[PDB]
């Protein structure tokens, strides 16, 4: 499991990046919905 231990920071960073992108996309979608209501 040494290779997985070495790659674990990369996997954690990738998951963090993915979560950040998903949260930003959902935030932008809600803003767009408010624009549509306006």
């Amino acid at each position: 499991q040494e290779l997985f231990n070495e790659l674990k920071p990369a996997v954690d960073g990738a998951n963090f990046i993915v979560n950040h992108m998903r949260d930003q996309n959902n935030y932008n979608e809600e803003k767009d919905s408010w624009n549509r209501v306006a």
Binding site: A14, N15, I17, M21, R22
Partner: peptide
Amino acid sequence: LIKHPEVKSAIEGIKYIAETMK
């Protein structure tokens, strides 16, 4: 190691990013 859920989540996440920017 691919069967680890975090790896698959990362792969699907980069796919989601690619589709989103497309």
